[PDB]
Amino acid sequence: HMVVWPMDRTCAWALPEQYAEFRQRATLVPAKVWDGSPTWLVSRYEHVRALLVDPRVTVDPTRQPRLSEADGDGDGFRSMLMLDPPEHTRLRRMFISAFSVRQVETMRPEIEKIVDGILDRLLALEPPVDILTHLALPMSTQVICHLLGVPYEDREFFQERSELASRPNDDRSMPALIELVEYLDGLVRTKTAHPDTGLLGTAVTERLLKGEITHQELVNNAVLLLAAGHETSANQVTLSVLTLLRHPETAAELREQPELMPNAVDELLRYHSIADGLRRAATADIVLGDHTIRAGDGLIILLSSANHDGNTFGAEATFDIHRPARHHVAFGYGPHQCLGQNLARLEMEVTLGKLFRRVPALRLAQEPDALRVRQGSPIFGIDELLVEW
Numbered sequence: 001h002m003v004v005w006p007m008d009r010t011c012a013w014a015l016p017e018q019y020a021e022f023r024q025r026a027t028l029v030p031a032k033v034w035d036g037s038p039t040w041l042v043s044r045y046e047h048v049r050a051l052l053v054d055p056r057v058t059v060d061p062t063r064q065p066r067l068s069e070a071d072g073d074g075d076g077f078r079s080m081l082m083l084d085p086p087e088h089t090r091l092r093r094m095f096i097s098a099f100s101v102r103q104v105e106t107m108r109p110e111i112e113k114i115v116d117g118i119l120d121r122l123l124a125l126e127p128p129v130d131i132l133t134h135l136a137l138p139m140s141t142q143v144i145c146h147l148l149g150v151p152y153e154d155r156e157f158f159q160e161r162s163e164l165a166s167r168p169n170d171d172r173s174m175p176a177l178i179e180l181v182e183y184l185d186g187l188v189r190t191k192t193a194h195p196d197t198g199l200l201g202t203a204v205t206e207r208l209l210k211g212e213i214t215h216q217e218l219v220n221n222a223v224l225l226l227a228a229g230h231e232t233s234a235n236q237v238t239l240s241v242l243t244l245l246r247h248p249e250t251a252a253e254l255r256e257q258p259e260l261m262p263n264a265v266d267e268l269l270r271y272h273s274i275a276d277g278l279r280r281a282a283t284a285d286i287v288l289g290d291h292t293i294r295a296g297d298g299l300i301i302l303l304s305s306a307n308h309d310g311n312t313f314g315a316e317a318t319f320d321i322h323r324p325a326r327h328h329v330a331f332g333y334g335p336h337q338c339l340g341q342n343l344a345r346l347e348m349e350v351t352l353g354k355l356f357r358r359v360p361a362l363r364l365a366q367e368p369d370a371l372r373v374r375q376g377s378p379i380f381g382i383d384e385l386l387v388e389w
């Protein structure tokens, strides 16, 4: 225990200075955590990847070192994201085909129509406008509600609850988590009696009414699909508008060459690495070069630091939309690698694409060293991003 964890980011785009020294090392950095349990931080691309696919690393919440007084296992609440193979595998198998490349590519039309209407609505407003509230959150939310069949009318309730649920060191995360489960509990009971199409109702029909999945399991993974599905993209899109605004050439080059967008999106994902500080524990000894991780040791997986690893990515702190960037780990790696990632990328490609095609002189409406940054959550972002045109 040298540096304390959790560490919060301080800048909308800078990673913490410490991370780069962490990578210059021969060991893993030890960290002091609320419960005094042995815990390493993991900073190198080589390492992050090795451990995330290793079979002796667990997500079991009871093995993770406790990071605060409010941090806990959630009273037996488990999504697939909190299970190891083979139980993990059974649950992810039921949801996977909805998310394949070619399957996700069939939603492009509905995503385009969706973002079209948000932009019409947004451009009707007197600027300056906030991107998170008027572009990023509306699209991620509508898109996830369409895929899942969750009512958009409910979005104020589940948005605010997801935000709070995803703060594991905050008092309010438990009641919000309880309420979200309760909301999906009612929704799944409804869909059970009246299956719709859309991912939840299709799983009622094919898995739940066929004996492949229980009621609590569907409910729990529905919380996960709902919250992951909007809160993440919302922040990635917001931060990305900032970054493109911060590098004007990039906005205009994309606007003038859309075939450059997919790699640009991957570069935005790498650069910001908004999902960070993943929690794992060793279940057996694990040899990583010089260092021997011991049965029971906690691990804090820094996707961001690995995405900014100099030994893998040249000029790591630079935003560069021409570096092949497909091999970043913004969506993790290994069994739990983001089930949504093709949907995330499509959403971004269409949202950023249409926004700068339409508001081609979009400008920052505030100075980007007065941005509030989100702290205390494994999903980074900024509270607000004001723009003019």
Ligand code: HEM
Residues within 6 Å of the ligand: 080, 081, 082, 092, 224, 225, 226, 228, 229, 230, 232, 233, 236, 274, 275, 278, 279, 330, 331, 332, 333, 335, 336, 337, 338, 339, 340, 341, 343, 344
């Ligand atoms: C930019 C957007 C997103 C980023 C950066 C992101 C990142 C990640 C990361 C890092 C993980 C792994 C966490 C871990 O191993 O502990 C993950 C898992 C997950 N993501 Fe995402 N994600 C995004 C969007 C989405 C979207 C749109 C969906 C749609 C529902 C989604 C669904 C999931 C699911 C279900 C998992 C759990 C997979 C499993 O445990 O097998 N994600 N994501």
Ligand SMILES: CC[C@H]1OC(=O)/C=C/[C@H](C)[C@@H](O[C@@H]2O[C@H](C)C[C@H](N(C)C)[C@H]2O)[C@@H](C)C[C@@H](C)[C@H](O)/C=C/C=C/[C@@H]1C
Residues within 6 Å of the ligand: 061, 070, 071, 072, 073, 074, 077, 079, 081, 162, 164, 165, 166, 167, 168, 169, 173, 174, 177, 180, 223, 224, 225, 227, 228, 232, 275, 276, 378, 379
């Ligand atoms: C790293 C990004 C993932 O962040 C995540 O995986 C986000 C995980 C959030 C933290 C977890 O919330 C914490 O859960 C604990 C078990 C209890 C804890 N509180 C009550 C002490 C609660 O905050 C999850 C369970 C919140 C659910 C709303 C939810 O499924 C969130 C899933 C989000 C997925 C993101 C992909």
